[PDB]
């Protein structure tokens, strides 16, 4: 499986999830099962936590290729969380057995997608650039923010999500957008 698009809407009102199953000749029998949303408060390493933010079952929506593509637009204010200060974790499950010719390593049923709001970072960069425009000196906080973002990126790409939550909550939690 894979993600087509996974972002918060530019209006800061919807959390867009668009999932699709791989087009492979050995993934016909694989479908989509569910979408589970978790935040930095409920996140656990071993799969989706209990008491999740939003559980979604795909067979409710449809009445077979429809099962292989799913799109959602979840109004974030219905989820009762802050669109600026939340780090959504989107799990997806397959409910399907791939063929026996599947190459080693591709038969992964579960995936994960991290989501953050990029507006607050954008506004912070504009503030720091405005400070730079005066007297052409770079604030040290700007370099710190850049490198802290790089740290969170490395943590996410390496799968070390708990320390990413630590960094996010400590450094970027108070955000205006």
């Amino acid at each position: 499986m894979h993600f087509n698009e996974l972002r918060i809407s530019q209006d800061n009102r919807f959390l867009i999830i668009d999932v699709s199953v791989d087009n492979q000749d050995y993934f016909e029998d694989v479908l989509l099962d569910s979408i589970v949303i978790d935040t930095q408060d409920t996140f656990v390493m071993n799969g989706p936590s209990d008491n999740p933010l939003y559980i979604y079952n795909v067979e409710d929506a449809y009445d077979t290729q429809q099962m292989k593509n799913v799109r959602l637009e979840l109004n974030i204010q219905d989820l009762k969380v802050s669109p600026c200060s939340t780090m959504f974790f989107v799990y997806v499950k397959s409910k399907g057995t791939p063929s026996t010719d599947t190459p080693c390593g591709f038969d992964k049923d579960q995936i994960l997608g991290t989501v953050i709001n990029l507006q607050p970072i954008y506004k912070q960069t504009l503030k720091y650039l405005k400070e730079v425009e005066c007297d052409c000196n770079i604030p040290k906080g700007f370099i710190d923010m850049i490198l802290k973002l790089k740290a969170i990126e490395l943590c996410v790409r390496t799968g070390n999500y708990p320390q990413a939550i630590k960094y996010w909550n400590k450094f970027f939690i108070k955000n205006n957008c």
Binding site: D33, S34, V36, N46, G47, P48, D50, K93, K95
Partner: peptide, 19 residues
């Protein structure tokens, strides 16, 4: 964890084996 249904079926199958 979520334990989708086929995991429960696997657990049943194993447990029912030496049943």
């Amino acid at each position: 964890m979520f334990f989708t249904q086929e995991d429960y079926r696997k657990i049943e199958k194993w447990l029912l084996a030496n049943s």
